[PDB]
Design a protein around this nucleic acid. Structure first.
Ligand SMILES: [K+]
Ligand SMILES: [K+]
Ligand SMILES: [K+]
Ligand SMILES: [K+]
Ligand SMILES: [K+]
Ligand SMILES: [K+]
Ligand SMILES: [K+]
Ligand SMILES: [K+]
Ligand SMILES: [K+]
Ligand SMILES: [K+]
Ligand SMILES: [Mg+2]
Ligand SMILES: [Mg+2]
Ligand SMILES: [Mg+2]
Ligand SMILES: [Mg+2]
Ligand SMILES: [Mg+2]
Ligand SMILES: [Mg+2]
Ligand SMILES: [Mg+2]
Ligand SMILES: [Mg+2]
Ligand SMILES: [Mg+2]
Ligand SMILES: [Mg+2]
Ligand SMILES: [Mg+2]
Ligand SMILES: [Mg+2]
Ligand SMILES: [Mg+2]
Ligand SMILES: [Mg+2]
Ligand SMILES: [Mg+2]
Ligand SMILES: [Mg+2]
Ligand SMILES: [Mg+2]
Ligand SMILES: [Mg+2]
Ligand SMILES: [Mg+2]
Ligand SMILES: [Mg+2]
Ligand SMILES: [Mg+2]
Ligand SMILES: [Mg+2]
Ligand SMILES: [Mg+2]
Ligand SMILES: [Mg+2]
Ligand SMILES: [Mg+2]
Ligand SMILES: [Mg+2]
Ligand SMILES: [Mg+2]
Ligand SMILES: [Mg+2]
Ligand SMILES: [Mg+2]
Ligand SMILES: [Mg+2]
Ligand SMILES: [Mg+2]
Ligand SMILES: [Mg+2]
Ligand SMILES: [Mg+2]
Ligand SMILES: [Mg+2]
Ligand SMILES: [Mg+2]
Ligand SMILES: [Mg+2]
Ligand SMILES: [Mg+2]
Ligand SMILES: [Mg+2]
Ligand SMILES: [Mg+2]
Ligand SMILES: [Mg+2]
Lengths: 254, 243
RNA sequence: CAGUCGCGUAAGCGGGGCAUAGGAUCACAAGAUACAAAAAGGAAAGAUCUUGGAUUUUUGGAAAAGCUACGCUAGGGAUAA
RNA sequence: GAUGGGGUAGCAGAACGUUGAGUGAAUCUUAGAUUUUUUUUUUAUAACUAAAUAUAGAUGAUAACUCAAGUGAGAAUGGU
RNA sequence: AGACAACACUGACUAGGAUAGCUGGUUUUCUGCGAAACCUAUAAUAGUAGGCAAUUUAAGUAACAUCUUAGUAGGUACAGA
RNA sequence: AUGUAUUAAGGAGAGUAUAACUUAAUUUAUGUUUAUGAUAGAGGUUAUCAACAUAUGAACUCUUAGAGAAAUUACUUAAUAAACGAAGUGAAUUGAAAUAUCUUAUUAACUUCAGGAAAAGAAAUCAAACGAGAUUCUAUGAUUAGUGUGAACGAAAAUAGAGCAGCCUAUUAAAAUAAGUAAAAUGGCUUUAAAGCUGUUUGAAUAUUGUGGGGAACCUUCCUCAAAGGCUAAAUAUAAUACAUGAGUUACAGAGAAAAGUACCGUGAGGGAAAGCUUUGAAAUAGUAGUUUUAUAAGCAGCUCAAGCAAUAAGAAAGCGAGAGCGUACCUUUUGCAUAAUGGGUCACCAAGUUAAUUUUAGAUGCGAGCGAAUUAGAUGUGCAUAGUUAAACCGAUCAUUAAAAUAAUGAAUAGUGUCUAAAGUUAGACCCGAAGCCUGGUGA
């Protein structure tokens, strides 16, 4: 079939409420280990600083006088004191600050993004949910936090305990690998819950996700609007002349 | 195990690295494939050096010159214009102007000094169109008209072609009129546009004027001639008879 | 092959000499071609074709004299006593 | 019952090792991780078994795959 | 006296800025193939370029080598005057 | 190392509570918050058991009045380093395989002047018949146009980005619109022959009602600008301090400097170290111990054959080895080296085809007559290819020579583009080490 279904869940209880449809060229591509390699390695070269520096014989401090006469001493003839053959000499072919980043076609970088997103789909590690994807922390704790009654060491010790037991029930915690939450914007509860308890997973903003982040944890929990906005920006090879992008098959029973 | 620990490029994409000066068994140990104590081992030999013998470009000399004033036309054939109309990528009912030829991708992305319509595959062209280009071959002008079309060669430049695609200039198949009896109509038309459009240039040199001033090329200045007058600004058609 | 000349009844012959020993480019000079002409009309200076003036004789083509025992450096048993 | 087997200059192919990096908030470790040694085995520039000595729960070590090089020294009247 | 001018003077010391067609050195393993010291040119002869031609792996082969049979070019050994 | 923020004169001598810094070398006060902070006690030397913010007393001598042998004299409310900037002057090594023009290079260096930056700057600019609209910095354009015998040198328009600001009534106080000027000849600079700078000798005109300058020899028309008068922030250069980041360093590394321009060397200019910690303890080397062999023998000390010794004990032989034979180190450089040719006392460590831009090839792979990039509505950002031919344009599936043309003759036609891995050509130190010498500025009798 040309299109593949996408079931939308309610994050708290994981209840299938809606059904969307995407093209097979979005979440059902073949696993190309050579394309994911070029994209994963293309991102590592960009995050690299590449500022290492070393001094050559022309940059090492000191004078450029001849150390000893050309001949007559019985020792090996020598020139300047900064030669690589000296103690404090400079490294000939040493490192220098340069640009380690490489290039990658926009179409190939988008195919790797949609290839990494289909690898999670066919394996069941892509769990899309409705909007408002945030940890449903207890109301009592939320009221005390705002009140200021709870000290920092208590406000943090509780979140770490809640997120831990909440992920163990869902089988999404450190036991079953980890889980990555991808939202459109930054949410206080979600991003704060995993900042104190990161062993259970992590949270990322749609603009902060990379091809490598979609292949690191056990599952990828992404929002409905975030996913559509993710494929709509990484389908250059497709949109050139459209294909099903978020076509709703089963509407939410309001 | 993990996906990130099982990714790699195709085997045929990797190649052997030659690190010289790293032992005899590697194959490039001592001299690193340089030889034994020569100029090519101690220093560098110039690329243009032939041992001292005079090169051929000196014994023969350089031939010709590079024309820096020639226009770099973007060629367009009829077989490629027919394929675009059949694919719905060029509307034949509307005038086919450089703006519609450049944005359609038929001549590519680069914008050159002009567009010339060539007549490759002229026997299979039977679509009536109204095209406008900078030049056109004799075999393409008759093919466009044999099918029931109209062709007019206008004067363009590399800059005026960019303004036609950017919308900063409106396309017109007529030159700027001359005389005090046209200022009223020309000035009145500019005001109604409500936008500052750049005018398309007209030919200024002798050769350029003579090109668009003759009917063989369907130049947009050919209407300024008489049935007997010649396009050349200097030569005239001699008279026949005995006198 | 085309062009157009000579000789020969004709067939045909003729793109120098019975054969094997005359250096370029650049620059310069004389003719032709109508190519391009830095706003434009011209021009200049260029380009193509033909042709001339050379012990460029170290003749694949630098405008070029010696001493060192006051001598120096890099090298050679690739080379003498 | 396949064919082939010396090698300088030189050309080409395939690998190991070293340093750091990613998977890694991973795996393992007083029921001994790690210990510059010794020993044992395997077609073996490497790793492995055991032994002896000391005692670490991570500023420890680590397979596999991949990434990047200040990556491999009996030879320079070489340098410390 | 090419004498002296603070280790140096046929031109000191010191800082800054070189080249070296020359000599020396160039670090792990396995595997496959495998030369040349000749010709031509060169202010060129211990240098370099172009060839012959080593290597890689693709497409071709009426390829290449060798013998057989038939044929051709050319004047050496020898022999002769 | 880079980036960001802030800042715009630097050092020395001697002395002093040896964390406390200037003969006052640990001054004296204010405000707030103080464990829900900030990022109901003890303690004035058995001290500073309080952080933040705003004030405050003190702060010597020399560089630095005059003199002198700087830190002295004698006086006195005496006081400004370097780097960066503009102008002036201006080489040589080097490359051209020599070398004069050229290149190196409007470089280094030196001199003057100036500020926290300076300079430059709102067109007598570029464009080309359409238009842009000051200066400055970065990239593309561009191994281009072009010059040069060569070697090589080398723009502008335009584009993108950083900043953006215009004016004379200049947010600092200036013009009655510029004459020995524009320009010419000549000698030079720069450069493409124009334009620009300039010594010498000469020497104009008065606004589109077309006067003047420019548009790359030159003339003409047109276009464009309006010299001989001025002001102007930002983006930029350098230094200092702070902070952020790191497939940067972790002690022969990183800055020369983990206590450093100190010790030490030199008359001097100047040159210029070593040295971390409580952990680990390799190799060489030295004195011994265990096993084993050795005082009749001519070993690059290894290899082949191998008696014997060697475990208190059931089992278990690593090692040393008499004796027999074979074997003249290694590397470099050479026609050829055990060579009495070169290099090494041993061991450990440092120590050599790398990076950047540019131009290619192969393989792999994405797209595909397009590729790449970049992008409520619109537009914008190099490039390569898609058509060939010629010295070149016109021309064009045809084109060029044939001085008219013409299947008369001859040649030339169909997948590109981006990325990665690797090998490479080119310019940069360019695989590493090494001259004698040349030039510039300083030092010393
Ligand atoms: K050598
Ligand atoms: K002209
Ligand atoms: K030589
Ligand atoms: K072999
Ligand atoms: K062989
Ligand atoms: K004969
Ligand atoms: K050129
Ligand atoms: K001039
Ligand atoms: K002015
Ligand atoms: K190395
Ligand atoms: Mg010197
Ligand atoms: Mg160093
Ligand atoms: Mg890479
Ligand atoms: Mg070899
Ligand atoms: Mg080689
Ligand atoms: Mg090679
Ligand atoms: Mg050689
Ligand atoms: Mg000769
Ligand atoms: Mg010859
Ligand atoms: Mg004498
Ligand atoms: Mg000899
Ligand atoms: Mg054999
Ligand atoms: Mg041990
Ligand atoms: Mg490193
Ligand atoms: Mg050594
Ligand atoms: Mg004498
Ligand atoms: Mg003397
Ligand atoms: Mg031979
Ligand atoms: Mg010569
Ligand atoms: Mg004084
Ligand atoms: Mg004083
Ligand atoms: Mg530029
Ligand atoms: Mg020459
Ligand atoms: Mg004026
Ligand atoms: Mg003047
Ligand atoms: Mg002029
Ligand atoms: Mg002037
Ligand atoms: Mg002109
Ligand atoms: Mg150090
Ligand atoms: Mg250490
Ligand atoms: Mg030891
Ligand atoms: Mg005996
Ligand atoms: Mg010899
Ligand atoms: Mg020896
Ligand atoms: Mg020796
Ligand atoms: Mg030693
Ligand atoms: Mg070390
Ligand atoms: Mg090393
Ligand atoms: Mg290869
Ligand atoms: Mg073309």
């Amino acid at each position: 079939i040309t299109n593949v279904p996408v079931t939308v869940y309610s994050f708290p209880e994981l209840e299938p409420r809606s059904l969307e449809s995407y093209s097979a060229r979005h979440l059902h591509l073949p696993l190309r280990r050579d394309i994911l390699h070029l994209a994963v390695i293309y991102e590592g070269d960009s995050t690299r600083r590449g500022m290492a520096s070393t001094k050559t014989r022309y940059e090492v401090h000191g004078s450029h006088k001849k150390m000893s006469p050309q001949k007559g001493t019985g020792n090996a003839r020598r020139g300047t004191r900064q030669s690589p053959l000296m103690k404090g000499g400079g490294k000939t072919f040493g490192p220098k600050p340069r640009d380690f980043s490489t290039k990658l076609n926009k179409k190939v970088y988008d195919l790797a993004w949609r290839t990494a997103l289909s690898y999670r789909y066919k394996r069941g590690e892509l769990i899309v949910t409705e909007d408002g994807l945030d940890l449903p922390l207890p109301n009592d704790f939320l009221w005390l936090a705002g009140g200021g009654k709870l000290s920092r060491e208590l406000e943090d010790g509780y979140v770490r305990k809640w997120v831990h037991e909440f992920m163990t029930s869902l089988n999404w915690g450190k036991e079953a690998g980890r889980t990555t939450f991808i939202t459109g914007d930054k949410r206080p509860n979600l991003f704060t819950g995993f900042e104190l308890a990161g062993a259970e997973g992590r949270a990322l903003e749609l603009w902060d996700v990379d091809v490598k982040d979609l292949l690191e944890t056990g599952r990828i929990v992404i929002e409905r609007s975030a996913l559509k906005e993710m494929i709509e920006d990484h389908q250059s090879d497709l949109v050139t002349r459209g294909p099903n992008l978020g076509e709703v098959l089963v509407r939410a029973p309001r | 195990a993990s996906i990130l620990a099982s990714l790699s490029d195709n085997r045929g994409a990797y190649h052997k690295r030659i690190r010289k000066g790293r032992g005899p068994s590697s194959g490039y140990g001592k001299t690193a494939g340089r030889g034994t104590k020569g100029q090519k081992a101690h220093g560098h030999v110039k690329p243009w050096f032939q041992g001292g013998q005079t090169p051929l470009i000196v014994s023969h000399g350089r031939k010709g010159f590079v024309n820096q004033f020639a226009a770099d036309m973007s060629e367009l054939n009829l077989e490629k214009l027919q394929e675009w109309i059949e694919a719905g990528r060029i509307d034949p009912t509307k005038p086919i102007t450089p703006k519609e030829i450049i944005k359609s991708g038929i001549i590519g992305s680069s914008i050159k000094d002009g567009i010339k319509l060539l007549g490759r595959g002229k026997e299979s062209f039977k679509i009536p169109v109204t095209i406008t280009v900078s030049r056109a071959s004799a075999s393409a002008i008759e093919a466009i008209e044999a099918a029931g079309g109209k062709i007019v060669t206008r004067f363009y430049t590399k800059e005026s072609l960019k303004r036609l695609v950017e919308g900063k200039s409106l396309h017109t198949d007529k030159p700027l009129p001359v005389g005090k009896e046209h200022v009223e109509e020309i000035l009145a038309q500019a005001r109604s546009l409500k936008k500052k459009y750049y005018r398309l240039p007209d030919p200024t040199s002798r050769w350029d004027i003579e090109y668009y001033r003759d009917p063989a090329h369907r130049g947009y200045l050919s209407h300024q001639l008489a049935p007997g007058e010649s396009p050349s600004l200097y030569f005239k058609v001699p008279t026949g008879g005995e006198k």
